[model samples]
Target chain A: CPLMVKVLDAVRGSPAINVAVHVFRKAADDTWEPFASGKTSESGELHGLTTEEEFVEGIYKVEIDTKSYWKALGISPFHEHAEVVFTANDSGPRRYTIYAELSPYSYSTTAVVTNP
Target chain B: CPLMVKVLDAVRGSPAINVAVHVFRKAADDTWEPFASGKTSESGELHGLTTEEEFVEGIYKVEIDTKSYWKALGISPFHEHAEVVFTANDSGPRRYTIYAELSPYSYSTTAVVTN
Candidate 1:
């Protein structure tokens, strides 16, 4: 069970906000299927995921409703949405970390690195 | 073992190119460390990793030589580099897939998802 994911907003000093994360899977034949979805907690982190119940090994993507998240906080974003794409190899349990940034004009995304 | 990463360039119909990937780690106290580094294969993919030998659980960042990678192909990319940051938990064997885009202005990164 070495599969998991954690998502966080990179905005510093902003009020607590929630963001949506959509999970999609690519099959062996290169077809994609919608998997699972979740939202960031008050701490801006999402974790503890089960692939069998949530995702499968293949290609995947995450689309964040950047516009809505910012609007709720009375601010405007530069970009409409933030998208992150990744691939999964081993299944069962894994942890994937996401780092998001909110700028005046747009949103940026960063993946947590296990190495330098 | 559930920790891995793959990096690539996201240009459509470009010449065969090579990109560099650097690995780093942060301790519980937040001290950063460089762990491993590699270049993308011909197909723009990097795989088969071990955290013990290459990475650990913490905040991490990746900077791509977008200027250099593109320069070699006789093009002037609007960006100087591309960056991607992600976190890791469960450490035995994991797979990470990266999707990159090369636009007129800059480069973008996407991580593969495993539900």
Candidate 2:
């Protein structure tokens, strides 16, 4: 399954605009190595974090560069970074979306497998 | 601040119809104590998990009883439980919503603080 991650601005109750997002795969050494990285779109969405042709079963992490986003908004950071960890199973050809909502103080993440 | 939790069925891409949800507060001894529990409504929503008057800053967890819901729909359980862990901050008077989307094999949660 391929994965998509979206970031939202919880304070404004809208998608987080222009935040940096990164995806990491757990390596054999128990270290998180960067797999893909990008910025959110106008709708606070990032797609193609993992490709359908290259997907595998493993532990993955999505990190949101929340400090910069909060700094730009002139608010004090509540959490140093917003991170989500999940296990991806070998459910073929399905697309999954992980939605992350962030405010200055707290954040939430949700994941769902969607149809192509 | 009060907390609201919503459960959805990802396969149907709509709010999960009638599921049980529970909220827990982490105690000082590292055990989870049940703070509140309820069932989702027709809209797959549960409000008042934590009351505004008694809300505090601490580690809290929300657990969705998915086995029963999935069994009722005749689907196998992918994850034993759909659980979310988050920290509640002292942001007064605002209502926070944690949206949970669940399929038989996968689940996702999102938290946002609203005015």
Number of the predicted model whose DockQ against the real structure is largest: 2
Docking class of 1: incorrect
Evaluate model 2: give its TM-score: 0.52
TM-score of each: 0.44, 0.52
Identify the runs in model 1 with alpha carbons over 4 angstroms from their true place. Answer: A1-116, B1-16, B27-31, B52-54, B91-93
| TM-scores for chain A over all candidates | 0.69, 0.89
Tens-digit lDDT track of model 1 for A7-110: 44445555235777676666666555676677767776655534444544556666566667777868744334565556544433334555665543434454
Q: Give the winner by TM-score.
A: 2
For candidate 2, the per-residue lDDT at B33 reads: 84
DockQ, prediction 2? 0.11
**Alpha-carbon RMSD to native, per candidate:** 19.1, 7.0
Positional deviation of B3 in candidate 1, in angstroms? 5.4
